[PDB]
Design an enzyme around this catalytic site. Structure first.
Site, PDB file in Angstrom:
ATOM      1  N   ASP A   1     -43.276 -21.426  27.897  1.00  6.50           N
ATOM      2  CA  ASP A   1     -42.009 -22.089  28.300  1.00  6.50           C
ATOM      3  C   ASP A   1     -41.347 -22.846  27.119  1.00  6.50           C
ATOM      4  OD1 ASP A   1     -40.725 -24.733  30.646  1.00  6.50           O
ATOM      5  OD2 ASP A   1     -39.787 -23.118  29.556  1.00  6.50           O
TER       6      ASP A   1
ATOM      7  N   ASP B   1     -34.591 -20.215  26.024  1.00  6.40           N
ATOM      8  CA  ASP B   1     -35.539 -20.683  27.088  1.00  6.40           C
ATOM      9  C   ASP B   1     -36.338 -19.563  27.770  1.00  6.40           C
ATOM     10  OD1 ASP B   1     -36.916 -22.025  28.945  1.00  6.40           O
ATOM     11  OD2 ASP B   1     -35.184 -22.643  30.104  1.00  6.40           O
TER      12      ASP B   1
HETATM   13  C1  LIG Z   1     -38.903 -16.076  32.899  1.00 11.35           C
HETATM   14  C2  LIG Z   1     -39.839 -16.923  33.774  1.00 11.35           C
HETATM   15  C3  LIG Z   1     -38.992 -17.599  34.846  1.00 11.35           C
HETATM   16  C4  LIG Z   1     -39.689 -18.277  36.013  1.00 11.35           C
HETATM   17  S1  LIG Z   1     -41.441 -18.340  36.197  1.00 11.35           S
HETATM   18  C5  LIG Z   1     -41.571 -19.193  37.665  1.00 11.35           C
HETATM   19  C6  LIG Z   1     -40.271 -19.395  38.044  1.00 11.35           C
HETATM   20  C7  LIG Z   1     -40.073 -20.159  39.282  1.00 11.35           C
HETATM   21  C8  LIG Z   1     -38.962 -20.010  40.080  1.00 11.35           C
HETATM   22  N1  LIG Z   1     -39.144 -20.926  41.055  1.00 11.35           N
HETATM   23  N2  LIG Z   1     -40.372 -21.629  40.866  1.00 11.35           N
HETATM   24  C9  LIG Z   1     -40.956 -21.135  39.722  1.00 11.35           C
HETATM   25  C10 LIG Z   1     -39.105 -18.925  37.190  1.00 11.35           C
HETATM   26  C11 LIG Z   1     -37.601 -19.075  37.403  1.00 11.35           C
HETATM   27  C12 LIG Z   1     -37.087 -20.225  36.510  1.00 11.35           C
HETATM   28  N3  LIG Z   1     -37.478 -21.466  37.099  1.00 11.35           N
HETATM   29  C13 LIG Z   1     -38.447 -22.266  36.659  1.00 11.35           C
HETATM   30  N4  LIG Z   1     -38.995 -22.134  35.529  1.00 11.35           N
HETATM   31  C14 LIG Z   1     -40.166 -22.954  35.386  1.00 11.35           C
HETATM   32  C15 LIG Z   1     -40.243 -22.885  33.813  1.00 11.35           C
HETATM   33  C16 LIG Z   1     -41.580 -22.394  35.558  1.00 11.35           C
HETATM   34  C17 LIG Z   1     -39.975 -24.425  35.448  1.00 11.35           C
HETATM   35  C18 LIG Z   1     -39.558 -24.507  36.899  1.00 11.35           C
HETATM   36  C19 LIG Z   1     -39.982 -25.589  37.658  1.00 11.35           C
HETATM   37  C20 LIG Z   1     -39.621 -25.593  39.020  1.00 11.35           C
HETATM   38 CL1  LIG Z   1     -40.189 -27.001  40.000  1.00 11.35          CL
HETATM   39  C21 LIG Z   1     -38.915 -24.526  39.623  1.00 11.35           C
HETATM   40  C22 LIG Z   1     -38.504 -23.429  38.842  1.00 11.35           C
HETATM   41  C23 LIG Z   1     -38.852 -23.438  37.495  1.00 11.35           C
HETATM   42  C24 LIG Z   1     -35.572 -20.222  36.552  1.00 11.35           C
HETATM   43  N5  LIG Z   1     -34.892 -19.098  36.318  1.00 11.35           N
HETATM   44  C25 LIG Z   1     -33.522 -19.046  36.388  1.00 11.35           C
HETATM   45  O1  LIG Z   1     -32.943 -17.969  36.126  1.00 11.35           O
HETATM   46  C26 LIG Z   1     -32.802 -20.189  36.781  1.00 11.35           C
HETATM   47  C27 LIG Z   1     -33.538 -21.358  37.040  1.00 11.35           C
HETATM   48  N6  LIG Z   1     -34.902 -21.323  36.937  1.00 11.35           N
END
Ligand SMILES: CCCc1scc(-c2cn[nH]c2)c1C[C@H](/N=C1\NC(C)(C)Cc2cc(Cl)ccc21)C1=NC(=O)CC=N1
Ligand code: NA
Ligand code: NA
Ligand SMILES: [Zn+2]
Ligand SMILES: [Zn+2]
Ligand SMILES: [Zn+2]
Length: 374
Positions: A31, A212
């Site tokens: 991340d 990101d």
């Molecule tokens: C390329 C990897 C992307 C990932 S892995 C797991 C998720 C995730 C989604 N919901 N919970 C986990 C996502 C979508 C991403 N959202 C997240 N990324 C992380 C880094 C893990 C931090 C976070 C905390 C929370 Cl509490 C919710 C979502 C995210 C994200 N993507 C977008 O396109 C827009 C906003 N958030």
């Protein structure tokens, strides 16, 4: 270290990390948009394994909690330190901060195969404050590992301390890191199928632009989102999609293997060059932004979404490229990836005699002004 990552854009890319002695090997989401090393440390419907602090003879509690809200969801836990090594990384062991996640909401996703996040950005945005040393800073300070890493996301490699030339073809082009908090960069121009969006270039970086790996989508500031959608729609106007599709809330489908790719334009993001007046462009294919998810049809989601916190160059964007986080020289490089079967391109230079400053200066809050960084 080549081939040392696994995963996909929808659910992220993770590196193997061994924590504690005796070793617990965990799959960790990489991340670049945060700065905490944090690992699930208690059972959860979605965790295949978690960090058992009680099995680690080398764990030390810091006696301090940390609470990390996100716009939707959160994690919290207890801070500590433990020994950490990277099986497919350099041959070193460091003592690092680790947050043991004890509670969360909407953080772990069903069937992701990662148990934890490795926040690779800088200490300014660490929680609860910038005195909690991020992992990569501990790694460099403790070993002689060069202060760089690269991500090749296909499935994938995070090379620590090195550039591996077998992972890319063509030129590597560097853009400065604007400020060391997020991996902030500056976008000087946007074209959609050859046409300039023609916005004041500060609008592209309002209120920041970052790289990101923890974000799936390309995310764009409101006015820029609206301009891009208007342009991609215009190009694809032989198909009338419902609004939900452009909101990223609905799939759109064609018969197996008949998708009219040509109706969808390429997107070029011109990044600031290392030399003044220069830029280079990363060119994004419709296959990056329109992602497959009716299982006789080919169906897709639009992976560009609106933002109120700036441009986010997420995983769907980085997937096409070898991306070098050269913290030592305070720059980020991009080259075309050597994983594949129009191509995603990295092209330059482009000279602008017109020397404009496209960065946005975020208004300085009293709270921010108040803090000493000794
Ligand atoms: C390329 C990897 C992307 C990932 S892995 C797991 C998720 C995730 C989604 N919901 N919970 C986990 C996502 C979508 C991403 N959202 C997240 N990324 C992380 C880094 C893990 C931090 C976070 C905390 C929370 Cl509490 C919710 C979502 C995210 C994200 N993507 C977008 O396109 C827009 C906003 N958030
Ligand atoms: Na430490
Ligand atoms: Na949990
Ligand atoms: Zn499992
Ligand atoms: Zn002081
Ligand atoms: Zn400080």
């Amino acid at each position: 270290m080549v081939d040392n990552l696994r995963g996909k854009s929808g659910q992220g890319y993770y590196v193997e990390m061994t924590v504690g002695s005796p070793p617990q090997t965990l799959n960790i989401l990489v991340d670049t948009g945060s700065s905490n090393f944090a690992v699930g440390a208690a059972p959860h419907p979605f965790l295949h394994r978690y960090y058992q602090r009680q099995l680690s003879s080398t764990y030390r509690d810091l006696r301090k909690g940390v609470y990390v809200p996100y716009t939707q969801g959160k994690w919290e836990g207890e801070l500590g330190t433990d020994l950490v090594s990277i099986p497919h990384g350099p041959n070193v062991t460091v003592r690092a901060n680790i947050a043991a996640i004890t509670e969360s909401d909407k953080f772990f996703i069903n069937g992701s195969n990662w148990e934890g996040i490795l926040g690779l950005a800088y200490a300014e945005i660490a929680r609860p404050d910038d005195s909690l040393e991020p992992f990569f800073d501990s790694l460099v300070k403790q070993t002689h590992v060069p202060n760089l890493f690269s991500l090749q996301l296909c499935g994938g490699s995070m090379i620590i301390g090195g550039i591996d030339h077998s992972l890319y073809t063509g030129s590597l082009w560097y853009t400065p890191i604007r400020r060391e908090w997020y991996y902030e960069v500056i976008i000087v121009r946007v074209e959609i199928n050859g046409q300039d969006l023609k916005m004041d270039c500060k609008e592209y970086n309002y209120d920041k632009s970052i790289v990101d790996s923890g974000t799936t989508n390309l995310r764009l500031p409101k006015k820029v989102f609206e301009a891009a959608v208007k342009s991609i729609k215009a190009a694809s106007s032989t198909e009338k999609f419902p609004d939900g599709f452009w909101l990223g809330e609905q799939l759109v489908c064609w018969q197996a293997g008949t998708t009219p790719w040509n109706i969808f334009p390429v997107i070029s993001l011109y990044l600031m060059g290392e030399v003044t007046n220069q830029s280079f462009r990363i060119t994004i294919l419709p296959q990056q932004y329109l992602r497959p998810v009716t299982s006789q049809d080919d169906c897709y989601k639009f992976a560009i979404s609106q933002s109120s916190t700036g441009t986010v160059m997420g995983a769907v964007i980085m997937e096409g490229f070898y991306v070098v986080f050269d913290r030592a020289r305070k720059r980020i490089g991009f080259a075309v990836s050597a994983c594949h079967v129009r191509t995603a391109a990295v092209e330059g230079p482009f000279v602008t005699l017109d020397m404009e400053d496209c960065g946005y200066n975020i208004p300085q809050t009293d709270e921010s002004r108040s803090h000493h960084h000794h």
